[PDB]
Design a binder for this molecule. Structure first.
Ligand code: NA
Length: 129
């Protein structure tokens, strides 16, 4: 599924991301825009052989099991394919664990380079919510 901007903002709010660990909703919508273009089916392979999955491009070296990242962890206790569902519950729950692990949203390279320090509430302006 490819979300609309305000549709995704509403879904993220319902699942408890607005102000989660101090990050306002616009940060999460900005991160999803540049990580995946709002597409739950996005995948990208990394040079170390791990793959990033889903609307927040969660990585198989630490967070999910894809059966082909030897010597990796599965800290969200999920198959990576669950991160590609049209239902974003699994991605949101795993993202809450990532952002809690000490490094905040700096775990998402696109957030650090394209969202951090910008007017992120622009991403939810005009939305009913
Ligand atoms: Na893994």
């Amino acid at each position: 599924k490819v979300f609309g901007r305000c549709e995704l903002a509403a879904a993220m709010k319902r699942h408890g991301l607005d102000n989660y660990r101090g990050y306002s909703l616009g940060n999460w919508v900005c991160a999803a825009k540049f990580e995946s273009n709002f597409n739950t089916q996005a995948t990208n392979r990394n040079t170390d052989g791990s793959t990033d999955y889903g609307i927040l491009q969660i990585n198989s070296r630490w967070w999910c099991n894809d059966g082909r990242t030897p010597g990796s962890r599965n800290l969200c206790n999920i198959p990576c394919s669950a991160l590609l569902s049209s239902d974003i519950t699994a991605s949101v729950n795993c993202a809450k664990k990532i952002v809690s692990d000490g490094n905040g949203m700096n775990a998402w390279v696109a957030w650090r380079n394209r969202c951090k320090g910008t007017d992120v509430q622009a991403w939810i302006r005009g939305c009913r919510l």
